Design an enzyme around this catalytic site. Structure first.
Site, mmCIF file in Angstrom:
data_model
loop_
_atom_site.group_PDB
_atom_site.id
_atom_site.type_symbol
_atom_site.label_atom_id
_atom_site.label_comp_id
_atom_site.label_asym_id
_atom_site.label_seq_id
_atom_site.Cartn_x
_atom_site.Cartn_y
_atom_site.Cartn_z
ATOM 1 N N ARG A 111 -67.022 -25.675 -40.685
ATOM 2 C CA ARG A 111 -67.179 -24.291 -39.649
ATOM 3 C C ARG A 111 -65.432 -23.420 -40.127
ATOM 4 O O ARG A 111 -65.097 -23.221 -39.880
ATOM 5 C CB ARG A 111 -67.439 -24.246 -38.842
ATOM 6 C CG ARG A 111 -68.311 -23.064 -38.261
ATOM 7 C CD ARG A 111 -69.397 -22.551 -38.594
ATOM 8 N NE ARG A 111 -69.838 -22.515 -40.265
ATOM 9 C CZ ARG A 111 -68.989 -21.626 -41.098
ATOM 10 N NH1 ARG A 111 -68.433 -20.350 -40.418
ATOM 11 N NH2 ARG A 111 -68.927 -20.888 -42.153
ATOM 12 N N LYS A 146 -52.887 -2.862 -33.554
ATOM 13 C CA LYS A 146 -54.275 -2.689 -33.608
ATOM 14 C C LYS A 146 -55.513 -3.944 -34.200
ATOM 15 O O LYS A 146 -55.586 -4.226 -35.208
ATOM 16 C CB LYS A 146 -55.241 -1.322 -33.805
ATOM 17 C CG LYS A 146 -54.284 -0.398 -32.824
ATOM 18 C CD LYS A 146 -54.846 1.066 -33.168
ATOM 19 C CE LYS A 146 -53.626 2.313 -33.360
ATOM 20 N NZ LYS A 146 -54.344 2.863 -33.926
ATOM 21 N N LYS A 178 -41.342 8.577 -28.508
ATOM 22 C CA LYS A 178 -42.166 9.940 -27.946
ATOM 23 C C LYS A 178 -41.885 10.500 -27.509
ATOM 24 O O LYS A 178 -40.892 10.801 -26.846
ATOM 25 C CB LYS A 178 -43.534 9.151 -27.953
ATOM 26 C CG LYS A 178 -44.744 8.502 -29.094
ATOM 27 C CD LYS A 178 -46.111 7.739 -28.469
ATOM 28 C CE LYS A 178 -47.312 7.399 -29.578
ATOM 29 N NZ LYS A 178 -47.725 6.354 -28.967
ATOM 30 N N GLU A 207 -41.833 10.061 -33.137
ATOM 31 C CA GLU A 207 -42.852 10.466 -33.279
ATOM 32 C C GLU A 207 -42.468 12.514 -33.145
ATOM 33 O O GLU A 207 -42.065 13.164 -32.296
ATOM 34 C CB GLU A 207 -44.256 10.262 -32.987
ATOM 35 C CG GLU A 207 -45.246 10.700 -33.020
ATOM 36 C CD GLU A 207 -46.221 10.476 -31.587
ATOM 37 O OE1 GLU A 207 -46.573 10.331 -31.205
ATOM 38 O OE2 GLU A 207 -47.720 9.710 -32.583
ATOM 39 N N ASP A 228 -47.593 13.234 -36.673
ATOM 40 C CA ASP A 228 -49.375 13.241 -35.585
ATOM 41 C C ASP A 228 -49.270 14.906 -35.745
ATOM 42 O O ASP A 228 -49.125 16.109 -35.389
ATOM 43 C CB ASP A 228 -48.634 13.282 -33.877
ATOM 44 C CG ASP A 228 -50.212 12.585 -33.648
ATOM 45 O OD1 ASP A 228 -51.132 13.059 -34.001
ATOM 46 O OD2 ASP A 228 -49.647 11.838 -32.678
HETATM 47 O O1 LIG Z 1 -47.632 0.288 -32.547
HETATM 48 C C1 LIG Z 1 -47.169 0.009 -33.923
HETATM 49 O O2 LIG Z 1 -46.443 -0.535 -34.394
HETATM 50 C C2 LIG Z 1 -47.854 1.540 -34.354
HETATM 51 C C3 LIG Z 1 -47.280 2.174 -35.864
HETATM 52 C C4 LIG Z 1 -48.099 2.440 -36.034
HETATM 53 C C5 LIG Z 1 -49.661 3.450 -35.899
HETATM 54 N N1 LIG Z 1 -49.535 2.478 -34.162
HETATM 55 C C6 LIG Z 1 -49.278 1.439 -34.213
HETATM 56 C C7 LIG Z 1 -50.764 1.101 -33.567
HETATM 57 O O3 LIG Z 1 -50.289 -0.084 -32.725
HETATM 58 O O4 LIG Z 1 -51.316 1.835 -32.740
HETATM 59 O O1 LIG Z 2 -74.813 -24.728 -33.887
HETATM 60 C C1 LIG Z 2 -74.304 -23.751 -35.184
HETATM 61 O O2 LIG Z 2 -73.412 -24.256 -35.275
HETATM 62 C C2 LIG Z 2 -74.711 -22.797 -35.205
HETATM 63 C C3 LIG Z 2 -76.699 -22.790 -34.823
HETATM 64 C C4 LIG Z 2 -77.508 -22.229 -35.493
HETATM 65 C C5 LIG Z 2 -76.940 -21.279 -36.609
HETATM 66 N N1 LIG Z 2 -75.607 -21.460 -37.110
HETATM 67 C C6 LIG Z 2 -75.144 -21.856 -37.203
HETATM 68 C C7 LIG Z 2 -73.195 -22.302 -38.055
HETATM 69 O O3 LIG Z 2 -72.381 -22.139 -38.087
HETATM 70 O O4 LIG Z 2 -73.665 -22.419 -39.235
#
Ligand SMILES: O=C(O)c1cccnc1C(=O)O
Ligand SMILES: O=C(O)c1cccnc1C(=O)O
Lengths: 289, 289
Positions: A111, A146, A178, A207, A228
C-alpha cells in the site's frame, strides 16, 4: 539558478521523514514491519516476487520514495528491478518495476509503496499534458504553494518530472510584493529597496495590475513581474516594453485553450495552481506473477 | 464499535503534528512566523479582518485544522468566527469564517490553513456526492487504505463529514485476507481459522473469488467477506445465501450508476478507494473585507 539544487537537496532530506510517517500511520504509530497482523498468516521465510503494472498511459515519478519504504522496513532484504525512471513516459499495461523479497514484507510495504507513486506520478502525468501545449513557444509552466499539506517538496519534484519549473519554495526564499506592500512602503521604488536590503540575495517579484503600475515596477529593479488581469493585447504589449530583466509571470490558472494564447504572447512564465492542488492518482497495482 | 473513538482520538494527536508539518515546509524549516520575509515590509501592528469564502456548493471540513494553524503561529493572538461546522452544506459565495488579528500573521497562515480546508472539504464534498446515490438502500459506503501519504486520519475524518463510513485505519486493526495469504495457509477455511487463533478479538474479513469459497468462509465464521469480481446476479444470490453475519463488502470503484445497481442487490458495504486517492480541492478565497 540553484533552486534545482536547493530542491534536490531538500527532498533527499525530506523523503525518509515522510515515508517514515506514511508507514507509521499504517503500522499503528510505530515503524515495525511485524505489526501487520494479516501478514502473520505466512511462514516468516516464504520468499516472494511481485510486479507493479500501470493500467493507464502516464509519466513515472516516485522511484526514490519506493526504495525508501522497503529500506525502512527491511533494508538489504528486498531487491528492486526498475524498468523506468523518474520522468519516463509510461504506457498502459507496461510493467514499471519488480520486487524480490520475503513475502510478509512485500504485502505490508505494498500500500504505502503504491500510494506514493500513484500520487507523484498522477501529478507528473497531469503536468506533462499541461506542458504539451506550450510546444514551439518560449514560455514556461510553473507551480505555486497550493499543494497538499506535507507533500510540498515531493509535489515540486513531480512537477519537475512532469516538465514544469518550480516557483519559490515558500515564504522564505523569495519576495512577492503586492498592493498592501506597495502602500506600506510609500512606493514600488521604496518597497523593492527595503526588500533588496532585508535579504539582499533573494529575488523580488512585484505584482502589477495595469500597464502603468508595471512601468514603475520595471524601473524599480524588480527582477520578476507578475500581471494580474491583463488581456492577450495588454500582455503582448507588456512584454514589448520589458525585454531585459523581463521576467513576466502570468497567473494563468484558467482554461486549456487560453493557455495557448498566453504563451503565444511570449510571456516568460505561466503559473498554474491546479497542477498541485488537485490529484488524479495514476491507476497502478502490484501483481504476484 | 469503537472505531469512531479510536479515530477521533488519533486525529486529536495527529493534527498538531500535521499543521506543524505544513507550517515548516513553507517557513523553511521552523514554525517561526517571522521567517516570512515579505511580511516584514508590513507595519507590525496593523490588524485586519479577513473573510474566507467558497465559490462552490459542497461540504465543510477543517475547523480544528484551521484553529491549529493560527494558534501555532500566534497562540491566542488571532480570533476566528465560525458560520459552518465540519460536515455542513456550503453554498456558493457563502461566508465560511472570519479572522480578526495582525495582518503579518493572517497573511502567512493564509496559504497553509487554506490548503487544509481545500483538501479536506474537497474530499468530504465528494463523499456526499457518493452517499447521495445510496438513498433508499441499506448500503454503507466505506473508504479504503488508499490515501495520500501523511493524511491517513485527516481523510478518514473528512470521509465521516461527507456521510461515509470508516474502514480500518491501518494494517494493525482488522484482518483482510486476500488470495496471497490464503495460499500460504493452505485453504480458505484454514486461513480464517488460523487468523482467529492468533488475534482472537480483531475483526476478520476474507476476500473470496467465487461462491464455493463464499460459503466455505461463511461457515468458517468470518464477519465480513469481500466479494472480488462478482457480477450483479452472483452478488444478489450471495446476499441470499449469507443472510446472517451477512457483513458483505464489495470493493466497487466501478462507476457512478453501476454503483446504485450494486447496493440495490442488498449488499452491506461498498468500499470505494476513489474517494481518498484523488483530490479535487474546493475553491475558496480569503478576501480582505
Ligand atoms: O506563493 C507563491 O509562490 C505563488 C506564486 C505564484 C502564484 N501563486 C502563488 C500561491 O501559492 O498562491
Ligand atoms: O483495508 C484495506 O486496506 C482496504 C479496505 C477495503 C478496500 N480496499 C482496501 C485497500 O487498501 O486496498
Amino acid at each position: 539558478d540553484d533552486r534545482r539544487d536547493a530542491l534536490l537537496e531538500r527532498i533527499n532530506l525530506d523523503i525518509p521523514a515522510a515515508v517514515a510517517q506514511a508507514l507509521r500511520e499504517d503500522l499503528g504509530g510505530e515503524v515495525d514491519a511485524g505489526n501487520d497482523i494479516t501478514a502473520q498468516l505466512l511462514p516468516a521465510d516464504t520468499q516472494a516476487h511481485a510486479t507493479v503494472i500501470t493500467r493507464e498511459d502516464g509519466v513515472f515519478c516516485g522511484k526514490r520514495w519506493v526504495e525508501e519504504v522497503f529500506i525502512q522496513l527491511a533494508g538489504d532484504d528486498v531487491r528492486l528491478t526498475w524498468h523506468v525512471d523518474d520522468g519516463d513516459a509510461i504506457h498502459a499495461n507496461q510493467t514499471v518495476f519488480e520486487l524480490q523479497g520475503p513475502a510478509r514484507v512485500l504485502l505490508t510495504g505494498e500500500r504505502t509503496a503504491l500510494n506514493f507513486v500513484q500520487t507523484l506520478s498522477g501529478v507528473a502525468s497531469e503536468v506533462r499534458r499541461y506542458v504539451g501545449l506550450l510546444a514551439g513557444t518560449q514560455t514556461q509552466l510553473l507551480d505555486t504553494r497550493k499543494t497538499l499539506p506535507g507533500l510540498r517538496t515531493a509535489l515540486k519534484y513531480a512537477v519537475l518530472c512532469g516538465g514544469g519549473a518550480n516557483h519559490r519554495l515558500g515564504l522564505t526564499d523569495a519576495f512577492l510584493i503586492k498592493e498592501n506592500h506597495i502602500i506600506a512602503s510609500g512606493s514600488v521604488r521604496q518597497a523593492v529597496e527595503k526588500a533588496f536590503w532585508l535579504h539582499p540575495d533573494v529575488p523580488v517579484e512585484v505584482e502589477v495590475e495595469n500597464l502603468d503600475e508595471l512601468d514603475d515596477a520595471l524601473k524599480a529593479g524588480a527582477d520578476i513581474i507578475m500581471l494580474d488581469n491583463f488581456n492577450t493585447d495588454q500582455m503582448r504589449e507588456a512584454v514589448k516594453r520589458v525585454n531585459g530583466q523581463a521576467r513576466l509571470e502570468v497567473s494563468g490558472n484558467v482554461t486549456a485553450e487560453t493557455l495557448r494564447e498566453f504563451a503565444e504572447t511570449g510571456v516568460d512564465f505561466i503559473s498554474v495552481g491546479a497542477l498541485t492542488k488537485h490529484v488524479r492518482a495514476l491507476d497502478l497495482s502490484m501483481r504476484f506473477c
